Design goal:
- By secondary structure, the protein is mainly β.
- The protein has two domains: 88 residues, Sandwich (Immunoglobulin-like), CATH 2.60.40; 216 residues, Single-stranded right-handed beta-helix, Pectin lyase-like (Pectate Lyase C-like, 3 Solenoid), CATH 2.160.20.
- The strands form three sheets. The chain has a 20-stranded mixed β-sheet that branches. Strands 3, 4, 6, 7 and 8 form a five-stranded antiparallel β-sheet that branches. The protein has a three-stranded antiparallel β-sheet with strand order 1-2-5, with no helix packed on it.
- β1 and β2 form a beta hairpin.
- The protein binds a molecule of 4 linked components (ADA-ADA-ADA-ADA).
- It is an enzyme of class 4 (lyase).
- GO terms for molecular function: metal ion binding; pectate lyase activity.
- Its EC number is 4.2.2.2.
Amino acid sequence: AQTTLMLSQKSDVNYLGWSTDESKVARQEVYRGTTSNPDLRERIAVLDAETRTFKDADTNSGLNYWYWVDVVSENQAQVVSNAVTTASSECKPGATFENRTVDCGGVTIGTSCPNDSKPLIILKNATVKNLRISASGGADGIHCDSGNCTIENVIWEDICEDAATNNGKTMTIVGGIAHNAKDKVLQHNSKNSTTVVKGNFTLTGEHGKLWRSCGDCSNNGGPRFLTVTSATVNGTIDSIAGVNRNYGDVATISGLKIKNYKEGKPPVCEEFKGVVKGQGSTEKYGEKWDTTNCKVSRSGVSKL
Ligand SMILES: O=C(O)[C@H]1O[C@H](O[C@@H]2[C@H](O)[C@@H](O)[C@@H](O[C@@H]3[C@H](O)[C@@H](O)[C@@H](O[C@@H]4[C@H](O)[C@@H](O)[C@@H](O)O[C@@H]4C(=O)O)O[C@@H]3C(=O)O)O[C@@H]2C(=O)O)[C@H](O)[C@@H](O)[C@H]1O
């Protein structure tokens, strides 16, 4: 197998994002050192088998750091990633991948962020992994335009418009770090489709919503589904999910951690009235728990 590791430095905190193709994961260990020498690294954490991200806030600046992540299987096999520090050619803006998995090997891409009224990567029943979207060249992020798409270990240094848009059947977010400065992270426009969030997808900075079933799209309708099983918001966010109840949307949220979380701060699942473009405006009903459209108990959300 293989483990590909990437690092994002935001607000004096080091965020690690990795993808692994190991099958029966038992645990994952994070190693950190003050030099390049792997032999001098030390275990600063032993994590569970599902997370694909890690936050190291116990670092002092002025000092460079090297990181490695060791993915261990049930058969105790150890798949150590490449080193990342604070010190393929197919992944370029405007690219379209179809019916395959493209490993971007941790490269950075971007164009620019327009000022008016443009997808960076379009996936048609495909998967993209180990990709970093630059701070200025975000455009309209990643578009899943058909079939099942997986966006694995993608780091958004900043979000220009939308981080990822589900215009397909199923959009799965596995791990990844999404940063934004003052917004829509996951935009869902297709109908009879699902958006899955796991691998502890992490949002940092300032955000609007983690996920929003389009409220006023042209030819709007539903149903649209969201299933969050693992995610973390280490910053401020207006709300987590926005469902159109009149359209049959269902948001199921568990395994979510939020920095300084408190009832209504921020609201998690909110119900709206969806409208067709031009035929009115979208009104917010409010935050809801354990309803037909908002399937999330207070047990599924906790303070980071
Ligand atoms: O004509 C189209 O179909 C259009 O689709 C894409 O754009 C999407 C929406 O059509 C567009 O109006 C916008 O919508 C978002 C959000 O999804 C929508 O619910 C609404 O959000 C309101 C409020 O305006 C926001 O500021 C915030 O407070 O949230 C509110 C809410 O009810 O949740 O308006 C939003 C917005 O204006 O950005 O973006 C949608 C998107 O997928 O990005 C295409 O991008 C567009 O070109 C066109 O094809």
